[PDB]
Amino acid sequence: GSSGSSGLDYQRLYGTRCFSCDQFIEGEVVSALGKTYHPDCFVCAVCRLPFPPGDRVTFNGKECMCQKCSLPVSVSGPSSG
Ligand SMILES: [Zn+2]
Ligand SMILES: [Zn+2]
């Protein structure tokens, strides 16, 4: 638990920080390409959807896209803000 914290040195520990938003990943971390990212940060760049544990993932420079997006869709256009 957390009771009786005098200072903030314990942090010194390795500590896993997301290489996306630059924030400590509490609970669980997603190890990808020998790095650390959040469960919501390591998502598509267009639709921003979480890649399934099965389907494949396309690699585009820095950001990745989902099969759905990567592939041609009958209905395409600008996404919400
Ligand atoms: Zn993040
Ligand atoms: Zn997508």
**The residue to which tokens 């993932």 are assigned:** 57
Triad 77, 80, 81: Cα angle to 5°: 130
Is 69 part of any known ligand binding site?
A: yes
The superfamily (CATH) of domain 1-81 is Cysteine Rich Protein (2.10.110.10)
Spans of all domains in the chain: 1-81
User: What residues have a C-beta under 5 A from ligand 1, the ion?
Assistant: 18, 20-21, 38, 41
> In this structure, which ligand is nearest to the CA of 37?
1
Residue 30's contacts (CB-CB under 8 Å, 6 or more residues apart) are: 36, 37, 38, 39, 42
In SS3 terms, 30-79 reads as: EEECCEEECCCCCCCCCCCCCCCCCCCEEEECCEEEEHHHHCCCCCCCCC
Triad 57, 60, 66: Cα angle to 5°: 35
